[PDB]
């Protein structure tokens, strides 16, 4: 009702129109200039061109998601100094156009990851899924990483061998593309060969080293962001665990605390993605919002469901997964109200994040799972929760 409701739109080529977005009830668009090569500067011209298309629909461009961080920055090799300079200028250009929140990630090599893009739920709709056994089969029988066996239980290894033996040639190709070619929003894509040689750049890069590389980026970017009035909102790792022998360093509350200890400026903040942090049971989403609320500048309000094997998860309906959506929304609303009580008034934009593929969308070739109807449904569910919390606790 008063909640700042936003919606990820990929641009003119997105099958979801800006009319669909408005009818969904979003007043704000989340988007990026996806066509601009990784690490190059986003010109004012390109920015204003996207901004105008959105304003034309009677919407506003609320959040950027994402400005990509070149791999040379994450490995701290090659042209990193130039890429950082460009990233800085992108932020200058963005703020000059009046776009003041930037979402970004530090997932190395791979972005957000799923093994199955078309998992049929009992109601007949389709969800994204991360099957631990599918993923083990990829790592040990397709990628053949040495020695990936250390990331798995004996039983999972036996199961991975069995699943692989039932896979068709095309099952194996699809699994591979699913994992490495890039899902919607990802700024990197690989063939198996490209992927395998890219992993080698990380043979001497452990958790501590990646943190060091991230620190170089933050200390360079945050002062520019602060100077220019832009707030940075880091998106967590998805899944928030180390995969493929590579570290993942935006997964837990310790990692969030590390980021604040590294750069104190308020320009250094967070995207509270409940779908991603919520994958692992040990993340206390509500505590995360209580502790880091002042720095939460963007939320993704979706939910996942862990299965019998707790590393296997699929995307749930927004109110029926592992995320206690009531408690999460309550904490966000309480954060917005303390801002208001400290004198300001500074809402936290939300987007429904992912949706199931359902109704008309089942007959379409869709961006997984950025189809419209499922995302509309999640948006509406969360709208309702938030409105009732406003009336029950803040009327
Ligand atoms: O939670 C997620 O995985 C999503 O929000 C992503 O689709 C999005 O691209 C994020 O910015 C991570 O790259
Ligand atoms: Cl969205
Ligand atoms: Mn998210």
In DSSP notation, 139-180 reads IIIIS--TTGGGGS-HHHHHHHHHHHHT--HHHHHHHHHHHH
C-alpha to C-alpha distance for 97 and 43, rounded to whole angstroms:
10
Cα 262 to middle of ligand 1, angstroms: 24
31 lines ligand 1 (CB under 6 A): no
Peptide bond into 42 cis (omega under 30): no
Cα 216 to middle of ligand 2, angstroms: 31
C-alpha to C-alpha distance for 230 and 226, rounded to whole angstroms:
6
Peptide bond into 66 cis (omega under 30): yes
How many other C-beta atoms are found inside a 10 Å radius of the C-beta of residue 77? 12
63 and 125 belong to one structural domain: no
Query: Which burial class, exposed, middle or buried, applies to 261 when counting CB atoms under 10 A from its CB (0-12, 13-18, 19+)?
Result: exposed
185 lines ligand 1 (CB under 6 A): yes
Nearest CA among 336, 317, 335, 334 for reference residue 325? 317
Peptide bond into 147 cis (omega under 30): yes
Nearest CA among 305, 309, 308, 310 for reference residue 322? 305
308 and 168 belong to one structural domain: yes
135 and 174 belong to one structural domain: yes
84 and 214 belong to one structural domain: yes
192 and 209 belong to one structural domain: no
Experimentally determined by: X-ray
Residue with CA at minimum distance from ligand 1 atom 1? 276
Q: Are 238 and 112 in contact (CB under 8 A)?
A: yes
C-alpha to C-alpha distance for 259 and 246, rounded to whole angstroms:
19
Cα 207 to middle of ligand 3, angstroms: 22
16 and 97 belong to one structural domain: yes
How many other C-beta atoms are found inside a 10 Å radius of the C-beta of residue 369? 26
Nearest CA among 84, 48, 49, 45 for reference residue 67? 84
- Number of compact structural domains in the chain: 2
**Residues annotated as catalytic (active site), given as ranges:** 235, 273, 300, 353-354, 370
281 and 310 belong to one structural domain: no
261 and 345 belong to one structural domain: yes
C-alpha to C-alpha distance for 157 and 149, rounded to whole angstroms:
7
64 and 98 belong to one structural domain: yes
CA atoms within a 13 Å half-sphere pointing along the CA-CB vector of 237: 22
Q: Are 51 and 100 in contact (CB under 8 A)?
A: no
How many other C-beta atoms are found inside a 10 Å radius of the C-beta of residue 34? 16
Model resolution, angstroms:
2.3
Ligand number nearest CA of 301 is 3
Whichever domain contains 296, its CATH number is 3.20.20.150
| Concatenated DSSP letters of 76-141 | T-TTHHHHHHHHHHHHHHHHHTT--EEEE----S--S--SEEEEEPTTS-EEEEE-HHHHHHIIII
Q: Are 374 and 361 in contact (CB under 8 A)?
A: yes
Ligand number nearest CA of 237 is 1
Nearest CA among 299, 377, 370, 388 for reference residue 335? 299
The DSSP output letter for 35 is T
C-alpha to C-alpha distance for 263 and 196, rounded to whole angstroms:
33
264 and 362 belong to one structural domain: no
Cα 141 to middle of ligand 2, angstroms: 35
Contacts of 36-39 spanning 24+ positions with Cβ under 8 A: 38/68, 38/70, 38/187, 38/188, 39/68, 39/70, 39/72, 39/79, 39/82, 39/83, 39/86, 39/87
239 and 342 belong to one structural domain: yes
66 lines ligand 1 (CB under 6 A): yes
Nearest CA among 84, 30, 27 for reference residue 370? 30
C-alpha to C-alpha distance for 154 and 225, rounded to whole angstroms:
47
103 lines ligand 1 (CB under 6 A): yes
What contacts 227, CB < 8 A, 6 or more positions away? none
Containing structural domain, residue 15: 1-104+201-301+320-353+373-395
C-alpha to C-alpha distance for 77 and 106, rounded to whole angstroms:
15
C-alpha to C-alpha distance for 173 and 291, rounded to whole angstroms:
43
CA 3 to chain CA mean position, Å: 21
Q: Are 348 and 386 in contact (CB under 8 A)?
A: no
Q: What is residue 267's three-state secondary structure?
A: coil
238 lines ligand 1 (CB under 6 A): yes
**Buried/exposed code over 145-162 (b: 16+ C-beta within 10 A; e: otherwise):** eeebeebbeeebbebbee
| Ligand 1 atom closest to 302 (CA) | 1
313 and 294 belong to one structural domain: no
């Amino acid at each position: 009702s008063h909640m700042e409701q936003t919606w990820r739109w990929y641009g003119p080529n997105d099958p979801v129109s800006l009319a669909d977005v408005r009818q969904a009830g979003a007043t704000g668009v989340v988007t990026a200039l996806h066509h601009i090569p990784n690490g190059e500067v986003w010109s004012v011209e390109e920015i204003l061109k996207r901004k105008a298309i959105i304003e034309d629909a009677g919407l506003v461009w609320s959040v950027v998601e994402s400005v990509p961080i070149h791999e040379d920055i994450k490995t701290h090799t090659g042209n990193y100094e130039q890429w950082i300079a460009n990233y800085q200028q992108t932020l200058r250009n963005l703020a000059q156009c009046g776009i003041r929140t930037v979402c970004y990630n530090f997932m190395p090599v791979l972005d957000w990851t799923r093994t199955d893009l078309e998992y049929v739920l009992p109601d007949g709709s389709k969800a994204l899924r991360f099957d631990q056994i599918e993923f083990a089969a990829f790592e040990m029988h397709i990628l053949k990483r040495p020695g990936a066996e250390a990331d798995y239980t004996e039983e999972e290894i036996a199961q991975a061998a069995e699943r692989f033996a039932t896979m068709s040639d095309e099952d194996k190709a699809r699994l591979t593309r699913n994992i490495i070619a890039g899902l919607p929003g990802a700024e990197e894509g690989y063939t198996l060969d490209q992927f395998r040689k890219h992993l080698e750049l990380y043979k001497d890069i452990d958790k501590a080293k990646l943190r060091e590389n991230f620190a170089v980026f933050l200390k360079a970017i945050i002062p520019v962001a602060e100077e220019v009035g832009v707030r940075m909102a880091v998106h967590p790792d998805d899944p928030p665990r180390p995969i493929l022998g590579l570290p993942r360093i935006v997964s837990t509350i310790e990692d969030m605390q590390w980021m604040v200890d590294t750069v104190n400026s308020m320009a250094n903040g967070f995207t509270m993605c409940t779908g991603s942090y919520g994958v692992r049971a040990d993340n206390d989403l509500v505590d995360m919002i209580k502790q880091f609320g002042p720095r939460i500048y963007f939320t993704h309000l979706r939910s996942t469901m862990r299965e019998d094997n707790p590393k296997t998860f699929h995307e749930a309906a927004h109110l029926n997964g592992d995320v206690d959506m009531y408690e999460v929304v309550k904490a966000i609303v309480e954060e917005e109200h303390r801002r208001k009580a400290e004198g300001k008034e500074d809402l936290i934009p939300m987007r429904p994040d992912h949706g199931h593929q359902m109704l008309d969308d089942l007959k379409k070739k869709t961006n997984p799972g950025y189809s419209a109807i499922g995302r509309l449904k999640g948006l509406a569910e969360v709208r309702g929760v938030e409105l009732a919390i406003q009336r029950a606790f803040f009327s």
